[PDB]
């Protein structure tokens, strides 16, 4: 049972820097009679299967981009991203298949860049909804960074807590900044006793909060 | 072109057992052995087991050993791994993989997605966003899909074909009911002149519903 460790766990770097991902095996790897070290690297992105790197440890997969280049011999590995592009974001695992297979627990790679304010959107509860009996005001927080943000709800003028569920994005891999949705779920005859619905985006960019608003009856 | 058919969702309750398949085609089934592979977001990628078509023959990681069986059916060319006495611990996305004899090239399932409770199958609701009424250069329309179990559900926009300037949220649980939304930004010159709908998918009801985003 060879037991893998990655590291680091996660890291962040700008695009264009490199990145060494380490992964170490609890016994060597190399084969004494096909000379080969069975060590393998896969990338997963948010929602797909992963995908072969490397493997034999050094040996890239047809198709995979040169900046890929896997190292190491015995029990230590590495992963090198020669310059990293925007589209690398990623969880990168190592699996070792000498006896058996274990991956190992991944390393995270996210990327820096600067800093973006929000764009904010608010959406009242569809006509469909409303005639199904239910009513949720959405708000998006798009293509922001960091990815810390608040967000707070105002019904007619006061705050409202109760009710809020936050979802946040994978970091976008096309220019790196996070999404947020914030929903505000509430019974249809609770939306019809309050007029003003507010949502209220507080990020670093700025000390102001970027607000959003719309009154019911004026629907 | 090689290709592993696996169900998008399962949903079993605690204490039964549940034989996930795995269906391939596009290579000669006896050639390659078969992996499976669960993910959770807490332990990652763990190997389950694999089994030799040819043989029989199987091995098991440690952890899974009495959790999991591996079978094959050579003649319709699919893979089964049966999971017994199932705990919340079991709900997971599980893959299969085929292993070419070329070790360059390995074939993914797509993942079914496992859940163990005793809860019911729910499809969603699925609610176009168009803006508030009331111009910019640019408008920002969203989908809800609202009040389905278990997961997963896959959106798309314009059948695939609208990707650039979306945003998809994972969704929350609340009350044995997921919700998740997404949106789209698009120039005010597309859209409301060009048709734009969201398409959800909800495996576990064989749910595929299109959703138009009209204006308000």
């Known amino acids: 049972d060879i037991v893998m460790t990655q590291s680091p766990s996660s890291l962040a770097v700008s695009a264009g820097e490199k990145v060494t991902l380490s992964c170490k095996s609890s016994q060597s790897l190399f084969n004494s009679r096909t000379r080969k070290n069975y060590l393998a690297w896969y990338q997963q992105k948010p929602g797909l299967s992963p995908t072969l790197l490397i493997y034999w440890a050094s040996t890239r997969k047809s198709g995979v981009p040169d900046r890929f280049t896997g190292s190491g011999s015995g029990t230590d590995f590495t992963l090198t991203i020669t310059s990293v592009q925007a589209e690398d974001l990623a969880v990168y695992y190592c699996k070792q298949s000498y006896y058996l297979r274990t991956f190992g627990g991944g390393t995270k790679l996210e990327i820096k860049r600067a800093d973006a304010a929000p764009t904010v959107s608010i959406f009242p509860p569809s006509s469909e909804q409303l005639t199904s009996g239910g009513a949720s005001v959405v708000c998006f927080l798009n293509n922001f960074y960091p990815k810390d943000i608040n967000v707070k709800w105002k019904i007619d003028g006061s705050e409202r807590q109760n009710g809020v569920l936050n979802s946040w994005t994978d970091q976008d891999s096309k220019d790196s900044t996070y999404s947020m949705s914030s929903t505000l779920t509430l019974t249809k005859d609770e939306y019809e006793r309050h007029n003003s619905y507010t949502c209220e985006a507080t990020h670093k960019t700025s000390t102001s909060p970027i607000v959003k608003s719309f009154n019911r009856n004026e629907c | 072109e090689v290709q592993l058919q696996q169900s998008g969702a399962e949903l079993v309750r605690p204490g039964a057992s549940v034989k996930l398949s795995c269906k391939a085609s596009?290579?000669?089934?006896?050639?390659?052995?078969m992996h499976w592979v669960k993910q959770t977001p807490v332990h990652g990628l763990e190997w389950i087991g694999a089994?030799?078509?040819?043989?029989?023959?199987?091995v098991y990681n440690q952890k899974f050993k009495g959790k999991a069986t591996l079978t094959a059916d050579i003649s319709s060319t699919t893979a089964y791994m049966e999971l017994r006495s199932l705990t919340s611990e079991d709900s997971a996305v599980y893959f299969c993989?085929?292993?070419?004899?070329?070790?360059?090239?390995?074939?993914w399932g797509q993942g079914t997605t496992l859940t163990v409770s005793s809860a019911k199958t729910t499809a969603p609701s699925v609610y176009p966003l168009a803006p508030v009424c009331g111009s910019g250069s640019s408008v920002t329309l969203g989908c809800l899909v609202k009040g389905y179990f278990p997961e997963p559900v896959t959106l798309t926009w314009n059948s695939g074909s609208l990707s650039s300037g979306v945003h998809t949220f994972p969704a929350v649980l609340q009350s044995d009911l997921y919700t998740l939304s997404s949106s789209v930004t698009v120039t005010s010159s597309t859209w409301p002149s060009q048709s734009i709908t969201c398409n959800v998918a909800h495996p576990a009801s064989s749910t595929k519903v299109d959703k138009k985003i009209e204006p308000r």
């Open positions: 993989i085929s292993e070419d004899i070329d070790e360059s090239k390995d074939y």
């Open positions: 596009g290579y000669t089934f006896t050639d390659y052995e």
């Open positions: 089994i030799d078509p040819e043989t029989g023959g199987t």
